[PDB]
Design an enzyme around this catalytic site. Sequence first.
Site, PDB file in Angstrom:
ATOM      1  N   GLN A  30      10.763 -85.507 -25.917  1.00  0.00           N
ATOM      2  CA  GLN A  30      10.388 -84.153 -26.294  1.00  0.00           C
ATOM      3  C   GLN A  30       9.808 -84.105 -27.694  1.00  0.00           C
ATOM      4  O   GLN A  30      10.441 -84.544 -28.675  1.00  0.00           O
ATOM      5  CB  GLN A  30      11.616 -83.235 -26.232  1.00  0.00           C
ATOM      6  CG  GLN A  30      11.382 -81.740 -26.472  1.00  0.00           C
ATOM      7  CD  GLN A  30      12.653 -80.894 -26.387  1.00  0.00           C
ATOM      8  OE1 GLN A  30      13.719 -81.376 -25.987  1.00  0.00           O
ATOM      9  NE2 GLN A  30      12.633 -79.619 -26.752  1.00  0.00           N
ATOM     10  N   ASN A  90      10.808 -74.764 -23.400  1.00  0.00           N
ATOM     11  CA  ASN A  90      10.827 -73.323 -23.676  1.00  0.00           C
ATOM     12  C   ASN A  90      12.248 -72.912 -23.998  1.00  0.00           C
ATOM     13  O   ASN A  90      13.125 -73.775 -24.079  1.00  0.00           O
ATOM     14  CB  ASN A  90      10.326 -72.489 -22.461  1.00  0.00           C
ATOM     15  CG  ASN A  90      11.053 -72.683 -21.126  1.00  0.00           C
ATOM     16  OD1 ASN A  90      12.286 -72.720 -21.037  1.00  0.00           O
ATOM     17  ND2 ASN A  90      10.337 -72.838 -20.020  1.00  0.00           N
ATOM     18  N   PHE A 122       7.419 -81.946 -23.165  1.00  0.00           N
ATOM     19  CA  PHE A 122       8.128 -83.177 -22.895  1.00  0.00           C
ATOM     20  C   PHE A 122       7.333 -84.005 -21.903  1.00  0.00           C
ATOM     21  O   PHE A 122       6.572 -83.479 -21.075  1.00  0.00           O
ATOM     22  CB  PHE A 122       9.532 -82.915 -22.330  1.00  0.00           C
ATOM     23  CG  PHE A 122       9.654 -82.034 -21.092  1.00  0.00           C
ATOM     24  CD1 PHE A 122       9.584 -80.651 -21.213  1.00  0.00           C
ATOM     25  CD2 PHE A 122       9.897 -82.613 -19.854  1.00  0.00           C
ATOM     26  CE1 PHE A 122       9.783 -79.857 -20.103  1.00  0.00           C
ATOM     27  CE2 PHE A 122      10.082 -81.807 -18.742  1.00  0.00           C
ATOM     28  CZ  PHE A 122      10.026 -80.434 -18.872  1.00  0.00           C
ATOM     29  N   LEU A 149      13.972 -79.106 -12.697  1.00  0.00           N
ATOM     30  CA  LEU A 149      13.308 -78.216 -13.639  1.00  0.00           C
ATOM     31  C   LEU A 149      12.192 -77.416 -12.997  1.00  0.00           C
ATOM     32  O   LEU A 149      11.630 -76.519 -13.646  1.00  0.00           O
ATOM     33  CB  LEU A 149      12.720 -79.001 -14.805  1.00  0.00           C
ATOM     34  CG  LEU A 149      13.643 -79.876 -15.646  1.00  0.00           C
ATOM     35  CD1 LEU A 149      12.833 -80.664 -16.662  1.00  0.00           C
ATOM     36  CD2 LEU A 149      14.673 -78.996 -16.325  1.00  0.00           C
TER      37      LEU A 149
END
Lengths: 165, 165, 165, 165, 165, 165, 165, 165, 165, 165, 11, 11, 11, 11, 11, 11, 11, 11, 11, 11
Positions: F63, F102, F113, F122
Site C-alpha cells: 500500500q 479508502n 494498493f 474486497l
Amino acid sequence: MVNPTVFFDIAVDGEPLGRVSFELFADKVPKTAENFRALSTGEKGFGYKGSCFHRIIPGFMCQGGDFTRHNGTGGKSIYGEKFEDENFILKHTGPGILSMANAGPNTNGSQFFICTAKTEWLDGKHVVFGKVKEGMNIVEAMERFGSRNGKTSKKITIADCGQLE
Amino acid sequence: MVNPTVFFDIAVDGEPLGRVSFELFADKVPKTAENFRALSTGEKGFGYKGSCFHRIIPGFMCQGGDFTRHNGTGGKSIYGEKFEDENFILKHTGPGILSMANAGPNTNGSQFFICTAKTEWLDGKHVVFGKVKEGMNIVEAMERFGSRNGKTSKKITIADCGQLE
Amino acid sequence: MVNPTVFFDIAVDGEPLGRVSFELFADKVPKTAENFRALSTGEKGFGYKGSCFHRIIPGFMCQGGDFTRHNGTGGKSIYGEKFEDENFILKHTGPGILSMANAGPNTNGSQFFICTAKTEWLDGKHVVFGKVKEGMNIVEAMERFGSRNGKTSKKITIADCGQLE
Amino acid sequence: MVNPTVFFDIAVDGEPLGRVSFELFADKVPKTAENFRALSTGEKGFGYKGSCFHRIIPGFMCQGGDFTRHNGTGGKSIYGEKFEDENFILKHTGPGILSMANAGPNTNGSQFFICTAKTEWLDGKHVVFGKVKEGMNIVEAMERFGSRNGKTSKKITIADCGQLE
Amino acid sequence: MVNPTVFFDIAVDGEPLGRVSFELFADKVPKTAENFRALSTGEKGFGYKGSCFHRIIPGFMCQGGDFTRHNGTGGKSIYGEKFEDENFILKHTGPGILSMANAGPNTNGSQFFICTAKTEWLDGKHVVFGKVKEGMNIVEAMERFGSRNGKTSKKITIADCGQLE
Amino acid sequence: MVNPTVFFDIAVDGEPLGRVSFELFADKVPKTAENFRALSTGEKGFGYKGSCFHRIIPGFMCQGGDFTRHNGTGGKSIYGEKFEDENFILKHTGPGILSMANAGPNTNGSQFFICTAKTEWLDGKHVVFGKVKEGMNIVEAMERFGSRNGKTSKKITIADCGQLE
Amino acid sequence: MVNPTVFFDIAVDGEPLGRVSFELFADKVPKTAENFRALSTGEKGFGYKGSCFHRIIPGFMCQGGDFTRHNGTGGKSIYGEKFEDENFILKHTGPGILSMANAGPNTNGSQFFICTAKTEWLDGKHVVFGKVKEGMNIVEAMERFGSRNGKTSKKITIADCGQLE
Amino acid sequence: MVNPTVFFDIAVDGEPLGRVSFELFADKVPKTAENFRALSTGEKGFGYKGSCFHRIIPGFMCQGGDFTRHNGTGGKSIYGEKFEDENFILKHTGPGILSMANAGPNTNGSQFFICTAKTEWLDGKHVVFGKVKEGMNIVEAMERFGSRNGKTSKKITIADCGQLE
Amino acid sequence: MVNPTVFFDIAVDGEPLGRVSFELFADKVPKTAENFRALSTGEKGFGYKGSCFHRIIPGFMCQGGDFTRHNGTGGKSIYGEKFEDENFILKHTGPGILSMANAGPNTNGSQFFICTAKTEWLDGKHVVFGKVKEGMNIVEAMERFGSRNGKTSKKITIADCGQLE
Amino acid sequence: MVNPTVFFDIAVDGEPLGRVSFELFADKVPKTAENFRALSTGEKGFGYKGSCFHRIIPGFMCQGGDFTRHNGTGGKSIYGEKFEDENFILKHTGPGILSMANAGPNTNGSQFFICTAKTEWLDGKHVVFGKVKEGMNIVEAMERFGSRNGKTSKKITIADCGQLE
Amino acid sequence: XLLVTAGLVLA
Amino acid sequence: XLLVTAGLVLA
Amino acid sequence: XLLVTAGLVLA
Amino acid sequence: XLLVTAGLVLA
Amino acid sequence: XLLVTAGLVLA
Amino acid sequence: XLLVTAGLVLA
Amino acid sequence: XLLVTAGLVLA
Amino acid sequence: XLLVTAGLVLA
Amino acid sequence: XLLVTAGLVLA
Amino acid sequence: XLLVTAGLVLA
C-alpha cells in the site's frame, strides 16, 4: 497466500477418538478464518482447547465453540464480544463444511458447527469459512453420541488443537 | 441506575492544570457510558491514564482517547476493536458536551471529544454520552494550547483519572 | 466558534455601487461557510474578486460565483470540483438569505445566490449558509439591472471582497 | 416574489354569469402557478379562453382546463406533454382551493379543479396552487349545473380570461 | 376492554416475601397482555407458578418467565414458540414497568422483566405491556439479591400467581 | 481512448530495485485511472514521485500513495480531498491488481494498493483500476520487506514515476 | 360536504331490538363511506338487509357485513371483490366507531365492526369510516349476546336498513 | 414499428465533408428515437439543421444537438423542456453508438453524442438509442478537429439532415 | 387446467371480415385470462360483443375492449372496476401477442391490444395473457384501417365472439 | 438427515379409495417438512387423521389440512397458530407437488394442497415442500369429486396416515 | 471543514 | 419556473 | 473525467 | 483481518 | 451493557 | 368514489 | 388476541 | 411515443 | 426445525 | 381466479 490448516484431537470423556483437520478459507473470509485459527492455537490467551461439543444432531451437524459457558450461551471472538458477518460467498454444499453459529445477523463469536449433511436452508444466514481436510470418519463417530434434540451422551471434548499449515 | 461521574486530572507538559469531572448519561446510552467509565478507571487493564489530547481546535473541541497510537488512528473499546452507535437520543447542545469520535457509522473505540462550542452539525453522526460537571474553566485553559489545524503546543495529558460516583 | 463576516464591493460597468456584508452561519454549516469565506479572501489563489453576477431575476435572486466560466457553467470549491450538500438545517426564510446554487444533489462548487424574496420551494434542495448583515439596498440596486429571464443590462461585478469578522 | 391574480369570466350557455378571480401561490409553487397564469393570458398561443368546465359535481368541485379534447382526456402545459408534481406544501383546506387534476403522479398538464368543499382525501396526490379571491358566489352558482356523475346541464364556458395582478 | 390485574406471590428461598400485583395494558397490547395473563393463571396447562427470577441487576431490572429452562434460554407463549412484537406504543417510562424480554425482533415467548428504573434505551426494541399496581416495595426487596452480572443469591420464586380482576 | 501505461522506479532506502509498469483501465474507470496517471506524471504540481510504501503485508498487498502524511492518513486526488467510487466493474482477480484504498464509501484520494494475492473479499468495496504490465518480480521483491503488521523493514520509495503510454 | 346517515333496525331472534343510526365520514373517506351507504340502501342489488352479526366479543366489538357466506368468509363491495385501503386519517378513538374488517392490506369488502371500546391497536390497519349517531344503547344490548370467543347466543339480524340523510 | 434511418450532411467550417446515416432503435426506445427523428426532419418547426457539434473529444465521442444556445446549455425535445429516461435496454457497446447527453436523470432534451469508442462506464446513465449505419469514416474525420477539452478547431456543422428510410 | 381458446368475428363497416381465435395463457395468468374469457362469452351480462377497436396504429397494435365508452376511457372487469397486475411472467415477444392496456399499475379493466410487432419497451408494465392461434391475416387486414395517431378509417367491430375450447 | 415419506389412506364417503405416499423435502425446507410429518403421525396429539379435503378444483389442486374447522378457516402448526414462510427455493413444477396454503405472508398453519397441474403463478407466494412418491392415480380419482368452485360431492377423508420412512 | 474523525481527518 | 441551477437552467 | 453532460461538465 | 484502509486500520 | 435478552446476553 | 383524474375516471 | 379479520381469525 | 393507455394517451 | 443458534434454540 | 387461501378465498 496459503490457506491455514488447523486440527482438533477429539476425546470421548477421556478416550482419545482421533484427529480432524480443517482447511480454513482465508482467501474468501479472512477475518472469520483468522478468528477460528487464533482460537485453535490459543495464541490470544483463550481458545478452544478443553471445550466440548455441546449439541450434536445426527445427520445434521456437531456444534461446539462455547468455551465460556459450555452450553451455547457464550463464547467470544478475538475481535470482541461479537463481529459482523463477513460475507456469504460460500455455501453449505455438503458434509464437512464448517460454518459459524450465531444468534441473528452480526453476532459471530466463537461457536461453529461441522455439517454432516448438506444444509442449504442455512445459506445466507451463517458464514461458511472452512472444510474438514482429514478425519471425516471421526466426525461420523462423534454423531453417534448425539440425539434428535441435540443432547450428547458422552462429553465430546477438544483434547488438543493447533495449527499445521 | 445512577449516572456515574469520572474525573480527569489534566497536566500541561507535566505541570498540573486541574480536574474536570464528567457526568456520564448512563440513563440514555449505558453501553457507551460503561465503556468510557471502565476506561477512566482502567479496571479492564487498559484505559486513559497517561494518554494525551492529540487534536485541540479552539472554539470547537478538544479530542483525546487514543491511548494506543496517540495520534488519532488507534484506541479500542472494552467491547473489542469497535462497537455500534448505541443511539442518537442526545444532541450536541453546547460547551462541555462529551461525545464519541468515530471513522463513520459504528466505529466507536475509545476516542472522544469535549465540545467547547455548540456543534449541531454533528448531531446524528456522533453519539453524545456525557457532560462536564465541574472544570469547564480547565477545558477552556486547554483550548489555549491548540490551533486551527489541531496541533497542540504543549503535551496535554490525562495525568490521573478514575471514578468519583 | 464565531461566525465570520465577509464583504463584497459591487461595481456596475466599472462604476462603483457599494458594499454588502454577509454573516456566514458557521455554527450550522461550517464546511459551506468556510468555502464561501476562503473564496472571498482569495487565500487559496482563486476566489470571487472580479467575477460577475450572471443571472439576476428581479424579485427572486441574484446569482453569482462562477469565476472560471463566468456564465453559470463553472466555478470550483476549495475542496475540489464539487462537494456534498452539508445539511439542510436552514430554510430560505426571506430576503437577504445566501444559498448554494447547484446542478442537482451534491454538486456544490462556488456559485451562490442572494435571495430578494422568501423562496421556500427551494428548501431541502439548496444549502443555506449565510445572510446579508448590512448592504441590502445594494442588492435592491442590483435587482434593477436584471430581467425575467435573468439577463443583466450592465456588467455587475464584485470589485473587491474579503473578510471583516 | 409577488403572487399573480388571474380572472375567468364565466358564461352559461352564452349568457354571462360573472367573474371569478384567483390568487396563484407563486410563492409556494412557482412552476405550477406560472403554467396556469400563462394559460390564462394565452401568451404562448394556446390557453383557457373559450374552453368549458367538463365535469361539475355539486358539493365537491368543478373541473376544467381541457382545451384540446374538452372531455378530460387532453390539455397540455406550457412546459410540454406533462410536468412533475412540484411539491405538496399546500392542502385542500376548504371551498375556493384551486388544485391540479392529473392521471397519477407527475402527469400535470392544464386541467384543474376548483373545490366547493374541503377535500382532504386528495392531499398529497394533487398539487394545490391557488385560491378564489373574488367571486366564490359565481362558483357556487356554477355548481348548480352539475350532477352526481359530473355531467353539466348547460355549457359552462370561460368566456374570457387574463391576468389582473 | 377492561385491564386485567394479575398477582405474583414471591418467595425468597423459604419465607414469603410478599405479593406484587400488575395491571396489564390490554387496551394497548391485547395479545401480549393475554399471553402474560393466561401464563399467570396457568389455564393452558403451563405457566409461571414455581418459576424463579433468574437474572436481577440492581437498579436496572428483574427478569423471569423461563419456566422451561430456568436459565434464560427458554419459555414459550400460549401462541407457540414465539410471537410477533405487537406494537411499541408504550415506552419504558420508569420503575414498575413490565416489558417483554426477547432475542431480537419477533421472538417474544414468556420471558419478561420488571424495570426498577426508567430504561429508555430499550424503547422500540421491547414491547411494554404492564405496570406494577401495588407491591413495588417487594420488587425493591427482590433487587437486593442480584449483582452487576444478574446472579441471584437466593432462589427468588413466584410461589403462586393468578388473576385478581 | 487508448489505455495509458505508467511506471514506478522503486528504491529501497537508496538502492534502486527496479521498474514496475502498470496498465491503467481507462476503458472501465476513466476518472479513477486519470487520477493515478496525472499523479504519476506530477503534471498538476504534486503526485507520487518520492513517496513511500507505508504498509506491506507479505502475501496480501503493498500500500502506497500517501504523499502528504506518509503514514496512511493523507493523500489527495487531482479532483480534491476525495472523490466518488466510480463503479465496481472489475474484480480483484489475482496478483498485480491495482486498486484504490479508502476509508469507507466515496473517500478515494491517492492511496492505492498492489495486490500480491487474489483478494476477492474486497470486491465491491474497493475500485480496481489497473494491472502490473512488466515488473511483477519487483513487487515480489518489495513484499520481502513487509510483515504481518504492514511495517516495512526498509524505506521503499518511488524514486521516479511517469507515463510511458 | 354533507356526510350521509344510515340506520340499521336490529332484531334479536326475530324480536325488534331497536334502531342504530350511523354518520358516515364521507369528508375523510368518500369511497369507503359510499360503499357502506350503497350496501345499506341496497341500491346495487345486494347489501345488508337481512344479514346477521356473526361475531360479537363483549367489550371489544360486534362484526357483521357478511351477506354472502354469513360467517366471516364472504361479503363484497360495490367496487368489486375487494378495494384498496383508502387512507388512515381517522383513528379508533372510543365506542361506537365503525371500521372496516379485512384480511390484511387492501382486502376491504363489506364486513365491518362497531367498536364497543377504544381499539387503538387496530389503528393504521383498519379504515375507520363512521360513528354511531343514535342507538349506542342498542349496541350495548347487542354486546350482551356475544361470548369471549365471538359466538352469539341469539341471531342478531339487520331487519331493515336504509339512508336517512 | 420499422426502424427509421436519418442522415446528417456534415460540413467543416463551410466545406462539405460527408454524410453519416443512423439506424434509430425505435423497436427498443420508440419515444427517444422519435424525438431524434422529428428533430432531424425538422417537422415540428425546430431541429438540428444548422446546429454545430460543440464538444468533440478524440477517442471518446462527438457531442452535438444544442440548437438553441449552441454550447451545451440548451436544446428542447419535441415533448417539452426535458423528458424521462425511457429505459436502459441498450449498452454503449462500441464506436458508432448514438446516445443521449443529459444533466442527470430524466433531463433528456435534444443533445446526443456519437461514441468513437466503447464507453461502458456510461451504461445505465445515458439512454442508447441509435447507431451509425453508413459513414463511420466521416465521424472519424470529425474526431480530428477535437481536443482533450472538447473545443473544436473548425466549426463542424450539420448542414442538412432528414429521414431516409 | 387446459388453456381456453376464444374467437372474435371481426366486421369492417358492417360487412364480415373474418375470425381471429386466441389461446389464453391460463397456465401463466389465470385471473387475467379468465377475465378475457368471461368477457368474450358475455356470461356475466356485459362483454366484448358489439364493441369496436377504437385505436389501431399500423406496425404497433390494435386496441379494443372499451365496451362502455367506446373511446379508451371505459370498460370494466368481471372482478370490479379494476384489478391488479397479476404477474409479468410473459413478454411481448412479437406479433399476435394479446396484452392488457391500463392507466398505470393495477388499473386493468377490459381494454386489451393485439400486438402487430414485438413491443419490448412495454415489458414489465402491461400483463401479456394470450396469443392469436388462427387468424393473424385478419389482424393484418385490420391494421390497414388505422393511422400513426390511432384514428380508424372504418368502424372495426367484434360482430360475435365466444369460446371454442 | 434423510427425507421422510408419509402416507394418506383416502376414503370416499367411508369406502377405501387408495393410498398416496409423499416424499417431504426436509433437505430444502426442514421446518415446513417436520410440521407436515408430525401432523401425519399425530405424535404431538393432533393431526390429519380423520380430516377431509374441503376444496378440490379439477385440473388445479386438492386442498385439505383443516382439521379444526373442516372448512378452510382453521388448522394449526406444531409450532403454534401460524409460522413463517421458510424459503421459496422450490417451485410448482407439475402434478404431485405438495405446497402450503396460507392467508398471506407468514400465515402457514396446517392447510396444504396437492397440485394436479403445474401452478407457476403461485411461485414465490406458497412454500413447496413435497411431492407424491406413489399414488398419483388416487389423486386423479379424488379430482373427480370436485367442481370449478371447489365444492366436493363426496366426503374425501384421510382415513389413516403416518410415516413410512 | 470541522469534523471529529479517527484516521482520515477531512476539511 | 424559478430555479437556481448551474448549467441546464430550467423553467 | 470522461462524461457527456449538458451544462456542468465535470472532470 | 485483511483490510486496506486509510486511517483507522482494523483487524 | 444493559440489555434484557433471551439466550446470548451481551454487554 | 370522488376523484379528480384526467382520462380513466374511477368510482 | 383481539383482531377483526375476514376468514383466518387469529388469537 | 408508443404507449397503450386507457384515458390520458401520451406521446 | 434445524437451526444452529447461540442461546434461543428454536424448532 | 385460481388461488389457494385459508379464509378469504378470492377469484
